[model samples]
Target: MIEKLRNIAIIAHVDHGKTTLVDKLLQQSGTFKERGITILAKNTANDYRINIVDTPGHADFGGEVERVMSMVDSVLLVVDAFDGPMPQTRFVTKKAFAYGLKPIVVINKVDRPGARPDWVVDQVFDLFVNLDATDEQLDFPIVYASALNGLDHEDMAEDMTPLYQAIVDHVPAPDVDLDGPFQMQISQLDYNSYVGVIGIGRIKRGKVKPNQQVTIIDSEGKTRNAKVGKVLGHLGLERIETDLAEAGDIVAITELNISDTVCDTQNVEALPALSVDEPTVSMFFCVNTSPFCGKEGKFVTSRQILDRLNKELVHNVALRVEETEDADAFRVSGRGELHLSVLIENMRREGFELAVSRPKVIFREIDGRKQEPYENVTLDVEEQHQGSVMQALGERKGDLKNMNPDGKGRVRLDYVIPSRGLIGFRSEFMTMTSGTGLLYSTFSHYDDVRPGEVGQRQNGVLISNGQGKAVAFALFGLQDRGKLFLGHGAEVYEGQIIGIHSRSNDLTVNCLTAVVLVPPIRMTLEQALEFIDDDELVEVTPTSIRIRKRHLTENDRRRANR
Candidate 1:
């Protein structure tokens, strides 16, 4: 039996020292262990059990924070002392406050030069005010420390003692309604080859025992009966099997999946179903039809591709897949471009060959009118480049929301832009900012479709008119045309995109007829997907990513254009 229990979640932007902070807390508490849910420390000194839930800060993975927030009574908001609040910081903090979570603000990375804890605190307070936090919430606690070295305002502490102390003292303990019938809401779903599906979350009321008959209520209010196979509890780094899991304890139970509830059989009542935002970005995933399709991949057939995509559906709640009119293609939708690109990257690494089309915004018909999704984008950039960055976004149909200077020679700009406006703007934004700007965007709402075209590449492509190995001499002469994508001896086929054209119209060049110290600009998976025009396709194989026209022959391309 435990006397005191503190259940909390940690939210921070990327590279804000969240993981290192957890490691030090673990080392200092002598637990030396980790995961999304783990025993942060069973402090013998204080006789308290602290369970911490780890959450991602990216908008694509914001589902993690949304689901896990229901299981924690409080949140530990980590902010960079030197950089202050970031785009993701604002995004997640809004969710935490909406969940009515008491927050403990930690000014992280204090050991670095120019660390400004005081200013960061003021910014956090202002953010809370903007989020409409309660007066009780506004009176938040603060901790100043360096997660890298476990030091508080500069010391060789080696152990994050003060941070641990703050958790026990400030974080509110979970309120347990242990006397009621069993009820547990699922926050996350995990699959095991041996165990099937496992649901992880906090028990809302009563207790559960292994092999006990229980009611499994899904989000749709459908009820089914099943016996609990196992009850697992958090201990250091391990999920130790337990006989019984009681209220207020975050535990894992087998034979359950996303949006399920384990309830008492006699008096069954379902909790509110977990929900996620609709996907804003969509793409076509088609079987690779190029000459080199099946040679490099194990799973190239449509049946195998469909099977793999169905398997992904079991755990990925935000992903949607539908068969397209073409038997070899499937339409997949996700939260954002990064979300879908991540799936493509993973599938390729698993020896799957497929071709993906350019990402497009999923439109809805609202009030008998075409409505498209919009995004709230935030950009942090040097003051000198602010005007150019704003100008570029304005051309892409971005509406300025706010602009403020941080007094450190940097400015923050906020905009609400249509989803289509951002389709291929990331690399362009990076180029305009000289790769020094930080940009983040999240889905806002659906609105009337914009009037004109949002985004398009200014230059055309150099398409190969003949199939053969590229010649070095041919490429040397073509260097002045634009950036090349291949080097000497690279295999080329008719209609393949060989290089970018300096002019606006596509040019058919004879790469085989001749082809660098001017090294070729190789496009990564994301870049290739973003670079292709409406008539092109990104042919992805296990060993290579080739950009080519949908119609592979120059004659066929001319006919299609006509």
Candidate 2:
């Protein structure tokens, strides 16, 4: 058995305060004060610096959640007191339970005006019952607090003293097997151009000091030995160099060459292996092929894309990439849409250009029948918007399970829908409710493949025919169609989507009509631009976001229709 170690992870929905709570725990534990400084503590523990292996709150990063949860012993489940359990709340909580981790529940945001700590506590019990938590797990301790204000109370009283003691008393100590040979599991990876590879993980058995020899195990079963140059521990957001770390303490060690990630390293020939959860969803990431592809991005080639992705494999265990049948395309798979989108967003910021398709659900054959993953979606919307919510969900094959009034003129609705039904739905859902509605979804079980068409946006998009700076006069001529996504003085390109067409059919338009030299009597630029309406395209780039027509030429549109 391992030594006296208590390794716990903090899990929660996006923005539910898991990272913030971790910050408080580290501060209250006196870990921060030990390093000196006497100001308010922030959720800096899991900030960008520590490589704490945060599970992405977005559904797209579901793959990251699965693999990371496997490395930890227990979990601290943080739930928002006002929002209760959200879709992601259910997803991550269920994952923690499945891994046999007893949870320490924290109902955060209790200080908010609408916060319902009591009801949220009951909801946690209900969720435990639903997930079939064992008697011991069901009896887990629950802490209520406002993580933002750094207030945690165990007695549900106004005082914060009880909450402070509960963390030290209840949260168990790390169990370490110090007498055994030194070993560790690589939970995260970091790179420094000067120092080379660094692997971060919990010490699973025994202790390791700097200058000790350790064997690295690759994911493919190959092994190699390397000297441990430095051992570091998390000190708030920074990694402080340490000479020793027993089991249970999270640490990062430098001087390693093996790349296949999340592998085991040990002082002896054989050590316990670390396994990873498989990816559930996949999408292609291809170099941008639009007319203005290379205009803004610095990295536009397949090789550049490949190199960046390879770097991710060193630390990101949940992501997988494969060359598509078409050499120009690469199939990248992960846990959810938000997970993949964050990667895309980061790449874009680094000046990489790429085009992505709508997310698709991955299916599997189960017991001779096809099955697809479903999500349990919960929504809180103002009473007046219930009809729109129901209509939109129904169209997406969502089956309503419950609907009730939330005592505040709002309605709470629950449904089970395919995971694919939620793709790109957040932006539209917010629009439908005028941004007053709140929606959350979590992965349910794999069910029989639902037979129905999914993902149909009500409107068509405007396509641009030519590339140039869009003129105000051209946009003014197209006003009555729909909402405008871009302002005047923007760029456009052929075949690139610019705006939503007001009608069901795609429309192409020219956005660069010039003002005539003798046009004093004719329509002015301002009057012509005002005529253009919603069903228009505003092509966006680093340099510009332009509005354009769906079909560039009447002849091309008519011939295509025929």
Model 2 C-alpha lDDT per residue in residues 334-396, reported as the tens digit of each score: 656666666765775688765544456667444677777788888988888888888887888
**lDDT of each residue in 1-562, candidate 1, tens digit only:** 3337777877778645776766555543543423455545656546666667776665544365677777788888877888887877777778887786678877877778878777887787776688877765435456776765633443445437766667776676766565668777777554434333445676667776544556656323233433343222333232222212222332333223455566877776876553654567878889888777688778998877876775675547676666555799888877788888888889988999889988878785556888988888989989888888878888889789888889999899889899888766777777788879698787888898885677678888888877688886588877688888887778877768878888898777786562134677768898898888788899887788889889876678779844
Q: Specify the highest-lDDT model's number.
A: 1
Model 2 score (lDDT)? 0.55
TM-score of 2: 0.49
Quote each prediction's TM-score.
0.54, 0.49
Model 1 ranges off by over 4 Å: 1-275, 514-517
**lDDT of candidates 1 onward, in order:** 0.70, 0.55
The candidate that achieves the highest TM-score relative to the unseen native structure: 1
Report the number of clashing residue pairs per model.
Answer: 5, 48
